Amino acid sequence: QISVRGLAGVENVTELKKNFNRHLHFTLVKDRNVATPRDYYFALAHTVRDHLVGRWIRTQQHYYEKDPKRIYYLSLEFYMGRTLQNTMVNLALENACDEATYQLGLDMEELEEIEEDAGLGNGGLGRLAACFLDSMATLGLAAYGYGIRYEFGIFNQKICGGWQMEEADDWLRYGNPWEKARPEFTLPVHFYGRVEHTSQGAKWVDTQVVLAMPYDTPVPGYRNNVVNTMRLWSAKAPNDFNLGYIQAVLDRNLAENISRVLYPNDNFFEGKELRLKQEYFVVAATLQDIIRRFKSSTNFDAFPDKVAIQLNDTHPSLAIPELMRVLVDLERLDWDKAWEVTVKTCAYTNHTVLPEALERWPVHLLETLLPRHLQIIYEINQRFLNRVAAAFPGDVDRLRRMSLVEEGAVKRINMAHLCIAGSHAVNGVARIHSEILKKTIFKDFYELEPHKFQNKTNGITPRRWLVLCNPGLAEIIAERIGEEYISDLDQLRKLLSYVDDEAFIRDVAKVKQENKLKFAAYLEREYKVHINPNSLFDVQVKRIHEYKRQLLNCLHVITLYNRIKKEPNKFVVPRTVMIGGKAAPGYHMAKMIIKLITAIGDVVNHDPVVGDRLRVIFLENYRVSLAEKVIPAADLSEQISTAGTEASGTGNMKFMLNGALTIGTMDGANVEMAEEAGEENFFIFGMRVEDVDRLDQRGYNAQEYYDRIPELRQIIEQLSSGFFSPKQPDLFKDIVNMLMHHDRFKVFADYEEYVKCQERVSALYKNPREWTRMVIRNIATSGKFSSDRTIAQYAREIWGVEPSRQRLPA
């Protein structure tokens, strides 16, 4: 049908059709008479999977012969989404499979909707790992993703009476065609026990053993015949576990609970023992695998030349003392040599400056669970602080600030300080974020070791986030500039010479309109909600957090409603305001924010005077597969975090690539986006980082804004009096109290500039040609934000490997 989706050759279509029928018969044990749509999906999945196998085997044998340096990306999260369409795209099979299924009397898009998301992540950090895997394969790096095979990923969100309800994400119920269990590579992981000192070293004894069974998932590069591996560990009880008899067998669940469920708290660190077990489990199993592969190529001096370990946040930070444990206790290397190897092997990526989100594990937990690791950490700390003392003699406070051990009521280990000490590289995820690390929370560490600190601005994969989700846009771009931009996104700059091209302007606008119609139809069919597709699609999708200021969005929505009610017969640009995202189950304020949004919708959507001029919809169960739908349909991307709080953001980049304009603060990657596109082509508003700092020095008084802005006063009085909750008048008292008395994120301070800037958005939307021309300027300058650029920077500046666009033989 469309060019970028590949060839549909006679030979290929015929071959796909028969392999489909073979799988339906032999693999699924069904005939066309009893087969359900789910059976058809699985027959297709197995057929496409067959095309990966040869490439997967030969990629791994290639790495064995060539023995390049291996990259190990360690993460507790891999937010993968669906695999079927992505695999077809990267293998150039999409058109052939579409034709093959069409001839079999099936609709491939319908079949694609049956696949469960692999929701093994919370949000940005987990999705970054997934985009990174795709880019590493595309750039021909010998890379492995290592994590946990959670039985239950991020919860499915249901909205009941306006409130978030959580249900188990049983994503493996029907099976996973993509994974291959490798029970032959099962490794033991140790917990508890005690440390015994002998004549020749320390010994970790009397431990409880949990088995780690790996499951491998293929990660195909974009049309380069490279297929890398994501290896996820599952927890298994050893067979003599607890071995009245019946209970012993049932107690095996205790051990296997380690890989049962993803922790959904992305707002606040919680020192829970099960989470610590998960962190060590992935780390211990992974490092044994790394060392085995290194030996199957004695001299650990060459270890850093053949191994890079990237730590996705501090979550796998136990890799540092675990590597030390193996090298010192098992391999018998001296401390200093082991430490040299460890530092040169490890690098750490930070994702937030918000203190409540940082991991600080109580010492008593580590003492009980991992007694030898605590000893190693204490030894690391002493030696590190000796260096600090020698570099800054007499600076006693620096010594207590930089310590990995935090004193207080409960002694804690600062995992971030451990990571800096034990890594040759520390990076933030956007230029402004990396600078904030150097100036604020890691200032002392930067002054000690400036060479260690880097920036690696985040990116997204243009395969999933353009070609897959927005083929219409991909195709019109390909018509003008060809196809090479898909793995070389900087080529989008060539689109700047089409900004005054009447045909391109018309095509860009046409693609957006079709995407909006398709999404408007998704809303009716699956949720029975009705929207005007001619309205401006105003969308804020991301996890619910105070710092992301969904609440500021809410205040604007209410302002629009109030202005309409004041002057009903005045023309306003019609808007569909869409807000979506999950709240962490223990985050009360975030759950109140969801309820507020639905409560506003209940009032606004049923007011006869409003009509189709304003609609407020909460997007239920926001996840990777829903993002692929809503982002291509968006006109306005809301990126409105308080300056200095969003490390980077990546949703922002997804919207920019797909033809939405951005209203945002100068925060995270928004700064670089505005820099690339031009400030005239971005809707920038609000306090900069410096303005926030000035307000903090003075003291933020919200009352001042309430007193001086009549329109804001009205909203607060509506919230307090029960206007949006007539049956429970004080339902939103917590929200009002927080806004008035303890708002860390200065919602009121940006309110005026935000509303003003929003008027400038509506004004532009009224001029369709000029709106579209600004869009083209955004799409054409989104190239920097490809995760191919990000990964090439990690590769060259941290890992010491050269990327390669060269094909492997088919």
Place this chain on the structure above:
Amino acid sequence: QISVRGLAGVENVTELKKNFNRHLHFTLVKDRNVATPRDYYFALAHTVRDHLVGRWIRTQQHYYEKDPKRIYYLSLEFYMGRTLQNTMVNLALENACDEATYQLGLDMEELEEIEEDAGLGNGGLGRLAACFLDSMATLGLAAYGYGIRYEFGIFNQKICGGWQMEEADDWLRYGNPWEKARPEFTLPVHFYGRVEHTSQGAKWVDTQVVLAMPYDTPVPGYRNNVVNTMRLWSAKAPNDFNLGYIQAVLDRNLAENISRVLYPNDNFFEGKELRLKQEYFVVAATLQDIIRRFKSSTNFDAFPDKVAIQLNDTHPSLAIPELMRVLVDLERLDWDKAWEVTVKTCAYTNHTVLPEALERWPVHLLETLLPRHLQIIYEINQRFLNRVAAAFPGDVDRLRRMSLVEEGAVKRINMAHLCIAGSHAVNGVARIHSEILKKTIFKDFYELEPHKFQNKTNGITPRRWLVLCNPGLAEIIAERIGEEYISDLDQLRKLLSYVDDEAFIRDVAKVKQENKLKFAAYLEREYKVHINPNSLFDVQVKRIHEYKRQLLNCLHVITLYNRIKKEPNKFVVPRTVMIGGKAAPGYHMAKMIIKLITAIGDVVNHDPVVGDRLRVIFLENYRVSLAEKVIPAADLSEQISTAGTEASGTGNMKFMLNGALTIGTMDGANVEMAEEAGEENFFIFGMRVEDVDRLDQRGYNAQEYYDRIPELRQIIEQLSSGFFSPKQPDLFKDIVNMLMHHDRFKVFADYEEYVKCQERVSALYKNPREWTRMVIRNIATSGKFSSDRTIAQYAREIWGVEPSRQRLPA
């Protein structure tokens, strides 16, 4: 190689070889360079499985078109063993696969050893269900086996310091190539709640829901292209289960624990709630499936014409009140009509007269777990007792004896009484057993409803128990009489005309010698124990129970040792005495018996004076796959239960078919075996049922035997004084005490006749030609004990269906 193993055609071998390589590559994702023996096994398993698929699909579609009466065999146990060789045998693929693998450079026998047993049973009852499935497929019956998919089957037995240790049987660790999950046929099962009475009937409300997910396993008939289904239910938590958040997800284990583990107590009924949940789970899920299939053919009068339900013991007895519940509460039939349907649908098979083994569920358990079923049971009881009172007016004691409700400290439901009341047929499993039911424990019920009581003598499948495990014997028989006997075992009678055939005598003896050499080699290779293959192989393999009198065997072993020590230079027929079997984990006496056996071995096997004349070996981890090895190697089959205690036995039949002579009591099926072969061709000894009865009336005094038999006194003095446990002199005090003071099974009473009869065995063994001639007389008359005969009797006399040997089209 050998005829009965089928053709190895050029086309088939070539096709098998390429499908093997296809599975290794695409299914296992391996090449010949990294593949382990386990990978090779799985590639073979998948290849053979492919040949089942077409036949499986068309067998099920055949039943849909023809709509015959369906047989539903309900069992908590299916002791299947391995599936690979059985599938090849029934599909005539064995020689072709052997050749195909040979050409690929692999040994198929080695690959076969890699498969885990499906050990979803304890012993005889579970193995009977498995043999029955094979026969029902072979006889072309529209039959389904229904049970539970246990994650852990019968424990693996390790012997440590002479003691039994139990470890989890994690049989699904590497996957099961034979099963197909059917998550689309998932059914809800209800627990707890309360009964609500409305204007129009009773209502079971406020229940907890557990999901039942089916897994289907193919059951191939012998070369008739019929493939039936064994459907096993797995427990799944519903997704809103318990739905702080983390714990709710982890608590899903509680629900899924239902299908976690097989209860290994085959000696003593234990009123454990988890076991009751298992029993209802299989029953509720199965009956919904039955009714659905019946509707997809309103009028339940025809239900018994299209449905037969066979209850394997009382374990699935809740089928009776569950069918009543569905018919009355859901379908709104009147009580009397529903009861008529239920009775005509259900039949019950009893497997023991030992009272401690009978299910008697406490009322308080049923009240809490299944409140509506208790109500239905009480109503059944009242109506049944009204019939008794009308038939036997004034007989108040009969009323209390026949009641389904047993009064006492704790009120209990007698599940056996429920089964008789609600079934149109009740059967024992051997002629003597069925007569004992009528004369003793079910006498009252027999007097009320004599037409209900039947005999169905047990049998074994000659496919697994001759062709599969003993191809050498199968082949020499086929040479003389052709191949038709494999599905018509009565044809073995034709072998009587070869009893004086010098070539046949020589061949029969040769096959036994090869089987003994092969097993002698298995013992050294896998266990490093050394045996003389020229000795008489004296074997007793079965679960460890007091009634089976492994202890009587032990007394004989010690007698032989003592006689050797008294007269060292006297000639005795050399013996290898092999005893094997698992003890239920809570059965203390049975665990002491295992320790005694190993303790005897420790003394006997290391005495220099004994030499290779006597060896005592405990066969560790006795299971279906070990039986297939040891039975063909046996010379003497020990079947020595106290008369009246072993309902039938089936191990006895396995030995008879494979060329062992039998030493046994007139108990269970031993009686019919001796009747078929002739008493002159059997080593019969000991008390008959009548002699036991006479001894009970008088009172059994063990002291009398001790006083009057000097050889027995010596043994007891050796046991008491610590001769077999020099470091713990009183280790066997419990055994001595039981034998002397509380022996329910009269071990001493049969001792003299047993030793005497054993001398007659040794005498015959000294004459190889005459031993072999007696063997031929046994093999030639073993035809009655084919489970094809058993199933044809169930079909004609209970289920009302005609078996068919006719082929389905390939």
